[PDB]
DNA sequence: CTTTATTCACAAGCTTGCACAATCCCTGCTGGACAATTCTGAGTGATGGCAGCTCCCACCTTTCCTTCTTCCTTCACTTAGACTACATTTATTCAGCATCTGTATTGTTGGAGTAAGTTCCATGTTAATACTC
DNA sequence: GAGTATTAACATGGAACTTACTCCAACAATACAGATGCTGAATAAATGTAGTCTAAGTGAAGGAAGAAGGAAAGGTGGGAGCTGCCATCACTCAGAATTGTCCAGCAGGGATTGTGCAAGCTTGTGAATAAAG
């Protein structure tokens, strides 16, 4: 009940900053893979903005995406 | 022996059959058309008729034996019996 | 209207006791010529028991079983009917339309040819046009 | 009842073309293919094709690839073939022929034929030629170069007139064929036998193999009365 | 293992369900009757009707390797052919029915 | 004198003609043409009256049927005249063909 | 010895010795328990009684006091359940129900 | 599961029209009557009239014909009910109801109703109030004027609401009804009891009588709980 | 556990009596044993309502024959006829 | 008793005669079997499966296979009349569908 | 529990109703030919499976087999081979 | 760079779904739908796998069918593209 | 490194006969299935004269030109 | 605007390499065949009569044929947009593996329910009878 | 003796007991297969444009379908006769079912194998664009 809405919440705006930025999901696995040396495919990245994941692992990827967050709106 | 009895469904009783049937205007064409499908029903109808009354050992056809292949063409009729 | 009700009630307990006793309605209306002389048929005792017979006929039956009742309490055959065949049935309806009244003339003529009394065949032929007439 | 009637007889000329009808009449013109053949003193009789009215499904003889073309109207129930570019050696009789899509089945109903005048499994009939009088047995046979699993069938043609067939799947009676006449044998040898004699058996004996897809004739038996 | 005079030769004199037809068109409609051709069509449609009934009970009863054919077969049938508030109803009566058969 | 336009009487022999319940094919040529259907069949044939009376019933339901689909697919081709193409489809989509 | 037949016991005016028999020679099934014929004779009964009744209403709507073909194939035709269930029958003299296309009116 | 959506509340002037819809969804659109009913305070619920999709049917009230017009759209499977020149007495509840085509079905679904307010057989229930503690048994009749053969139903109506089936054909439990209630009767003489009073039972009840063209509907009984 | 029949070893028998060399996949084993369990209902049902029509008890080779004609088309309803007596023929010449 | 040979053998037959009188015996068709009637049948029903077969393995051969599938069953029955006139309402599963594009579909010259 | 299946008819895609019109030969699909596809779709469905229910019920049973379905497929004058 | 006209690419996949027998729906969202038309009647019933293949098979051989009574409606009216008014005019004379 | 040169100079060859005489590629493939019962379609014989096809193909369809050549020197 | 040589995307054939499914083999087990007996169903006939043929006639309603009028169908031409085709992105499906458990299948009563048989009984028709003329 | 109604006996099919059997609920136990969940390739579906070509609207011509009127024919209904076959009834005998044995044909499971799919490479062609006449 409580986990739920933030990790909805961080895929809606993840989605949304991704969709302002103009980059891909494709794109995003890669530079994943390029700044923290885990790639991850783009299936990775839909079921994460579509929630079809386990709790336990959207969870253990949200760090990955929260940093990479962080670092594209300033580069 | 007869011959050259599809000509006695005139062309009048075509077009009552088609007014029953709800059309309102009829090709000049329409009536060769009609008289090869009906000659087509006909003769499947009869011959699974014959075959009933061959199976039977007789030689009149009754309204069972046509009402049984109807029902066996999947055109059931009912008032003749069964 | 009475005595349709007492009629009723007593047909019930002359049922009730023929079902107590096992005897059947046969067994009644073979009992009925050992008491009296008059043997009555199984018909007979089930028009009596559904209580559908006419008034007089009602009355008439009714002191026989009356008779009966008490000798089942603690204790000539008639009649022989005839039942025509098929064949003859066909050849005496052969005459509907053609000899409404073939009288005792075509009568003891058509009898001889059936092996059947003229009476039998006078009694038919009156039917017939009683038939007929309704 | 059931009839295919042809056209008349055709004079052409060198490198030209000629159609021919097989107008059918007395059966469901859709549940039947129609055979054509080619019968010629030189090579006696040779199976040209097929066209199945149902779906147009056609199939040719590899010789004639090319030569003829089948066709079918089912407006009026008419088989046509087309022959193009009519060489010398093309004059001859052309049969259209009935037969059921069943493999069982044969070739019964025959067209009168149109004669054109232009200005693989063998089989092997012993008997060409044969001498018998009006109450002999008469026997011939007709040796298959492959196996064909009983799909042969026996006709008779009397001088200048179509074939009749006799037998077909090498042991069944034709329709309205009397039952003197008898087949027998499978797989490679194949007999038909002509119990007593008669006038009217004088004409010459043909057996047809359909158990592969080119359909070959044999050379053909002669057949004379007294 | 005995005869004892045969008595089932029973001829079926032409024998139809016109009679039952009658009660139930005066059960529903009291004044009123109904031609011979609209009987014969009525015949013909029960026949119909019980025949296609039976057809289903059977195939039911063989598609399950039962050998009795009981209400339970018949219900399933009517519901399997007759369309939606045409047999439930047909249901309801036919349960009623049965509840009253046995019960005396 | 007046005279009436087509399309009214056409809709005055419909209503009427559907409103009937009558056999529309006279008797007697059906009969006829029973017997010739069926004399290819067996010889010495005999039919009661009631065979073909059920015979005529079935083919004159047939054909009415077949009308219908025939006008249903007329007006779907933005067409009120029946023609042959609209019969062979009719006949073509219920199975026939 | 007793009475009140089945037909009376399963209050039905169809006969249920009737439709047992039936079941019982038409080659259905090897047994046929004694619920089916009054289960199938009720339902045969309420269809009956289910047409005949829209057959009257029918006649009642045309100042008809009697029941004809054409009364069954306008209550036939005019439900569509009924329809359905028949929609592979003929009612011999019947007609068909009365409707002209829309497009085929003039205007 | 079954549904009949309808609109809002009408308000309207006098001499306008008033067009209601009710869209249904969840069953067969086509083989179900959509039944019309009005219900104003004086004179409890009347019959309306109603219209079969199936074929385009319609059937009105004598005392409406004219006043009231039925639709049908079967591409958006809706009912559209038309009133023309909305006089005073026009301001009411209008009910739309499913209704099967079987003579022994009765109307089972009801819509919610739409509030218009504009700026023969006799059915009679008995008891028009009536008391009942937590736990008794209670009885309501719907003596009728001329004889219906069991064609009659029970409704029940809380207040604001649209009425809810209770018992069809006389005897028998609607869908998703308690055996509690229990139906009675037929011919005349009918009877609807309720076995022991919980507080939902505090309500308006109705009997319907379907047999006639005319359907009428009882005057009604208002039951509230201690 | 259990045991279940079906068709599918004659169906291999006729196979390779037809095409000796030629094979045949499981589905199309599993649809032959369909066509051949549809084709016996049609013509057992169409033979059962043959001895009905005619107040018979007993289902014969003429009512196979009977039904065979009225359900097959007609080259195939006259090879399937042929067959069957050849075979009736043989049973009864046989033993 | 004596070897006892099938009634297949007795009448020439492949599919099995006695299996066929007893499915027709349980199968609530008819009081009594005839005991031709098994035979009849079981012939009936070999000749259309080696027709069918038949037309399969011409098909498949057709194709370059020498293993019938479904699709040269349904090639089998749909090319033939008769056949696809018997088997009208049959759906064969995984059979595929004839080729047939119409004439007005085609591209113009 | 098992959840709740909702909507699904959108599943059956425009590509997939595509593909099946191209089996049957058509070489241009009107916008509107998919929901019309569906409807139709939906309702055949629902058709067999209603008799396939009937049959598992009247079984006893809660798991629908292939039997059924054929039953059901049979009986609606759909006979379908490969599944006996 | 390189196009086909429109109605080549329709005419070649045409060809190429009429020469294969393999289902065109895909697995899951087929049984999908049959679980949710399946929970309208009963409540918690379980599928065999058999049964959902059985049911998409008749369903894509429908729709195939319906669809080739649909071209021959549209070909009929002297069109190329089906429309819905073919649709339902095949199914009225099929009688559905 | 010895075909490769003969087919060039036999594939010019055949470009300037071509062009002389006036026939088109289709032209071409059209009549040798005229004269040898083998069609082949233009976009062969334009490959042919633009020696994009492999040695094999050239070499198996060099004769056929080769008499098609001569053929049309006459006729 | 007419054709006619590149260019392109696609399917189709040739040639290995397996792996999944078809072919074959072994073991029970159960269903079909031998065989004598018992039990009916159905083929021969004989028959009485109903209904299907044939023929005849009189009436008039229906059908056929010709002429002219109407309006419906069919081409011809336009064009607005709604389909198709394709690149790119996004999303669901597919396949293998794992766990779990509600469900289907087999097993042994064994009691309720049904088949077969006999007799008893209710109803339509009518042979026989009492009363009158 | 005719005619009237009244009653009572018969033909017939259905129901009530009665017993022998058989069959299908009814728990018990145990595979097992259907469902749910993961995870990563694989394949597909959704979006957005460009652009063609198709459906639909307008309009005019002509010819085809229909309405009307008159002449003719043959369908309809009734009345006869004539007999062919059709439905009923009765008999016996030849075929079909019963029942106890047993054996060998077939189904399930386990080894053997080989047909065809898949991957790639080469190729020939139809569609569609650029060039040339």
Not at chain 3, 53 to 81: H, I
Not at chain 7, 80 to 98: H, W
């Given at each position: 009940?409580?986990?739920?809405?933030?990790?909805?919440?961080?895929?809606?705006?993840?989605?949304?900053?991704?969709?302002?930025?103009?980059?891909?999901?494709?794109?995003?696995?890669?530079?994943?893979?390029?700044?923290?040396?885990?790639?991850?495919?783009?299936?990775?990245?839909?079921?994460?903005?579509?929630?079809?994941?386990?709790?336990?692992?959207?969870?253990?990827?949200?760090?990955?995406?929260?940093?990479?967050?962080?670092?594209?709106?300033?580069? | 022996?007869?011959?050259?009895?599809?000509?006695?469904?005139?062309?009048?009783?075509?077009?009552?059959?088609?007014?029953?049937?709800?059309?309102?205007?009829?090709?000049?064409?329409?009536?060769?058309?009609?008289?090869?499908?009906?000659?087509?029903?006909?003769?499947?109808?009869?011959?699974?008729?014959?075959?009933?009354?061959?199976?039977?050992?007789?030689?009149?056809?009754?309204?069972?034996?046509?009402?049984?292949?109807?029902?066996?063409q999947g055109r059931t009729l009912y008032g003749?019996?069964? | 209207?009475?005595?349709?009700?007492?009629?009723?009630?007593?047909?019930?307990?002359?049922?009730?006791?023929?079902?107590?006793?096992?005897?059947?309605?046969?067994?009644?209306?073979?009992?009925?010529?050992?008491?009296?002389?008059?043997?009555?048929?199984?018909?007979?005792?089930?028009?009596?028991?559904?209580?559908?017979?006419?008034?007089?006929?009602?009355?008439?039956?009714?002191?026989?079983?009356?008779?009966?009742?008490?000798?089942?309490?603690?204790?000539?055959?008639?009649?022989?009917?005839?039942?025509?065949?098929?064949?003859?049935?066909?050849?005496?309806?052969?005459?509907?339309?053609?000899?409404?009244?073939?009288?005792?003339?075509?009568?003891?003529?058509?009898?001889?040819?059936?092996?059947?009394?003229?009476?039998?065949?006078?009694?038919?032929?009156?039917?017939?046009?009683?038939?007929?007439?309704? | 009842?059931?009839?295919?009637?042809?056209?008349?007889?055709?004079?052409?000329?060198?490198?030209?073309?000629?159609?021919?009808?097989?107008?059918?009449?007395?059966?469901?013109?859709?549940?039947?293919?129609?055979?054509?053949?080619?019968?010629?003193?030189?090579?006696?009789?040779?199976?040209?094709?097929?066209?199945?009215?149902?779906?147009?499904?056609?199939?040719?003889?590899?010789?004639?690839?090319?030569?003829?073309?089948?066709?079918?109207?089912?407006?009026?129930?008419?088989?046509?073939?087309?022959?193009?570019?009519?060489?010398?050696?093309?004059?001859?009789?052309?049969?259209?022929?009935?037969?059921?899509?069943?493999?069982?089945?044969?070739?019964?109903?025959?067209?009168?034929?149109?004669?054109?005048?232009?200005?693989?499994?063998?089989?092997?009939?012993?008997?060409?030629?044969?001498?018998?009088?009006?109450?002999?047995?008469?026997?011939?046979?007709?040796?298959?170069?492959?196996?064909?699993?009983?799909?042969?069938?026996?006709?008779?043609?009397?001088?200048?007139?179509?074939?009749?067939?006799?037998?077909?799947?090498?042991?069944?009676?034709?329709?309205?064929?009397?039952?003197?006449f008898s087949g027998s044998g499978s797989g490679?040898?194949?007999?038909?036998?002509?119990?007593?004699?008669?006038?009217?058996?004088?004409?010459?004996?043909?057996?047809?193999?359909?158990?592969?897809?080119?359909?070959?004739?044999?050379?053909?038996?002669?057949?004379?009365?007294? | 293992?005995?005869?004892?005079?045969?008595?089932?030769?029973?001829?079926?004199?032409?024998?139809?369900?016109?009679?039952?037809?009658?009660?139930?068109?005066?059960?529903?409609?009291?004044?009123?009757?109904?031609?011979?051709?609209?009987?014969?069509?009525?015949?013909?449609?029960?026949?119909?009707?019980?025949?296609?009934?039976?057809?289903?009970?059977?195939?039911?009863?063989?598609?399950?390797?039962?050998?009795?054919?009981?209400?339970?077969?018949?219900?399933?049938?009517?519901?399997?052919?007759?369309?939606?508030?045409?047999?439930?109803?047909?249901?309801?009566?036919?349960?009623?029915?049965?509840?009253?058969?046995?019960?005396? | 004198?007046?005279?009436?336009?087509?399309?009214?009487?056409?809709?005055?022999?419909?209503?009427?003609?559907?409103?009937?319940?009558?056999?529309?094919?006279?008797?007697?040529?059906?009969?006829?043409?029973?017997?010739?259907?069926?004399?290819?069949?067996?010889?010495?044939?005999?039919?009661?009256?009631?065979?073909?009376?059920?015979?005529?019933?079935?083919?004159?339901?047939?054909?009415?049927?077949?009308?219908?689909?025939?006008?249903?697919?007329?007006?779907?081709?933005?067409?009120?005249?029946?023609m042959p193409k609209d019969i062979q489809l009719?006949?073509?989509?219920?199975?026939?063909? | 010895?007793?009475?009140?037949?089945?037909?009376?016991?399963?209050?039905?005016?169809?006969?249920?010795?009737?439709?047992?028999?039936?079941?019982?020679?038409?080659?259905?099934?090897?047994?046929?328990?004694?619920?089916?014929?009054?289960?199938?004779?009720?339902?045969?009964?309420?269809?009956?009684?289910?047409?005949?009744?829209?057959?009257?209403?029918?006649?009642?709507?045309?100042?008809?006091?009697?029941?004809?073909?054409?009364?069954?194939?306008?209550?036939?035709?005019?439900?569509?359940?009924?329809?359905?269930?028949?929609?592979?029958?003929?009612?011999?003299?019947?007609?068909?129900?009365?409707?002209?296309?829309?497009?085929?009116?003039?205007?």
């Amino acid at each position: 009940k409580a986990l739920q809405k933030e990790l909805e919440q961080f895929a809606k705006l993840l989605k949304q900053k991704r969709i302002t930025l103009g980059y891909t999901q494709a794109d995003v696995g890669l530079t994943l893979g390029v700044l923290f040396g885990k790639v991850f495919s783009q299936t990775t990245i839909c079921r994460f903005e579509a929630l079809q994941l386990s709790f336990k692992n959207m969870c253990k990827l949200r760090p990955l995406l929260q940093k990479w967050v962080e670092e594209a709106d300033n580069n | 022996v007869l011959r050259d009895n599809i000509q006695g469904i005139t062309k009048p009783a075509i077009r009552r059959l088609a007014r029953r049937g709800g059309v309102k205007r009829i090709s000049g064409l329409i009536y060769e058309e009609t008289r090869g499908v009906l000659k087509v029903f006909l003769e499947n109808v009869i011959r699974d008729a014959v075959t009933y009354t061959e199976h039977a050992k007789r030689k009149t056809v009754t309204a069972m034996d046509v009402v049984y292949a109807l029902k066996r063409q999947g055109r059931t009729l009912y008032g003749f019996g069964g | 209207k009475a005595l349709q009700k007492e009629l009723e009630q007593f047909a019930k307990l002359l049922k009730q006791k023929r079902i107590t006793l096992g005897y059947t309605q046969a067994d009644v209306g073979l009992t009925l010529g050992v008491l009296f002389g008059k043997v009555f048929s199984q018909t007979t005792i089930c028009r009596f028991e559904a209580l559908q017979l006419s008034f007089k006929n009602m009355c008439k039956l009714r002191p026989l079983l009356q008779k009966w009742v008490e000798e089942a309490d603690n204790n000539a055959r008639k009649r022989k009917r005839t039942s025509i065949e098929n064949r003859v049935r066909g050849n005496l309806e052969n005459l509907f339309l053609q000899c409404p009244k073939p009288t005792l003339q075509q009568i003891s003529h058509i009898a001889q040819q059936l092996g059947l009394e003229k009476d039998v065949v006078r009694v038919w032929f009156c039917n017939r046009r009683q038939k007929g007439k309704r | 009842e059931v009839q295919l009637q042809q056209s008349g007889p055709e004079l052409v000329e060198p490198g030209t073309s000629v159609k021919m009808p097989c107008k059918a009449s007395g059966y469901t013109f859709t549940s039947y293919t129609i055979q054509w053949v080619k019968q010629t003193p030189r090579q006696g009789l040779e199976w040209i094709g097929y066209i199945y009215p149902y779906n147009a499904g056609t199939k040719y003889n590899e010789k004639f690839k090319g030569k003829a073309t089948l066709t079918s109207d089912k407006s009026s129930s008419t088989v046509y073939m087309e022959l193009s570019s009519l060489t010398s050696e093309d004059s001859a009789v052309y049969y259209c022929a009935r037969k059921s899509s069943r493999l069982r089945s044969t070739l019964d109903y025959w067209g009168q034929g149109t004669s054109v005048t232009v200005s693989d499994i063998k089989m092997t009939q012993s008997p060409s030629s044969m001498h018998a009088s009006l109450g002999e047995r008469v026997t011939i046979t007709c040796k298959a170069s492959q196996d064909i699993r009983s799909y042969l069938s026996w006709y008779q043609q009397k001088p200048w007139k179509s074939p009749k067939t006799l037998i077909y799947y090498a042991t069944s009676l034709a329709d309205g064929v009397p039952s003197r006449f008898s087949g027998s044998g499978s797989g490679q040898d194949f007999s038909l036998t002509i119990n007593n004699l008669e006038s009217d058996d004088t004409a010459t004996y043909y057996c047809l193999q359909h158990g592969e897809s080119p359909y070959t004739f044999g050379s053909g038996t002669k057949l004379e009365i007294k | 293992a005995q005869k004892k005079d045969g008595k089932k030769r029973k001829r079926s004199r032409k024998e139809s369900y016109s009679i039952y037809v009658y009660k139930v068109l005066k059960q529903v409609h009291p004044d009123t009757g109904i031609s011979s051709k609209a009987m014969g069509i009525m015949n013909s449609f029960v026949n119909d009707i019980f025949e296609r009934i039976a057809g289903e009970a059977s195939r039911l009863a063989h598609y399950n390797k039962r050998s009795t054919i009981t209400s339970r077969e018949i219900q399933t049938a009517v519901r399997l052919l007759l369309p939606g508030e045409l047999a439930k109803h047909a249901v309801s009566e036919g349960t009623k029915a049965v509840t009253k058969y046995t019960s005396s | 004198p007046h005279r009436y336009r087509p399309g009214t009487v056409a809709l005055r022999e419909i209503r009427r003609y559907q409103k009937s319940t009558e056999l529309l094919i006279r008797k007697l040529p059906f009969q006829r043409l029973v017997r010739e259907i069926a004399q290819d069949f067996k010889t010495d044939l005999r039919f009661q009256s009631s065979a073909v009376m059920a015979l005529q019933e079935a083919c004159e339901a047939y054909l009415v049927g077949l009308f219908e689909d025939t006008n249903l697919c007329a007006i779907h081709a933005k067409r009120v005249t029946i023609m042959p193409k609209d019969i062979q489809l009719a006949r073509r989509i219920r199975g026939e063909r | 010895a007793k009475a009140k037949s089945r037909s009376s016991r399963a209050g039905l005016q169809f006969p249920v010795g009737r439709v047992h028999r039936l079941l019982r020679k038409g080659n259905y099934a090897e047994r046929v328990g004694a619920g089916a014929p009054v289960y199938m004779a009720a339902v045969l009964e309420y269809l009956t009684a289910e047409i005949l009744e829209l057959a009257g209403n029918a006649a009642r709507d045309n100042k008809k006091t009697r029941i004809i073909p054409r009364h069954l194939q306008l209550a036939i035709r005019n439900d569509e359940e009924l329809n359905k269930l028949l929609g592979k029958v003929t009612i011999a003299q019947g007609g068909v129900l009365p409707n002209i296309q829309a497009v085929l009116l003039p205007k």
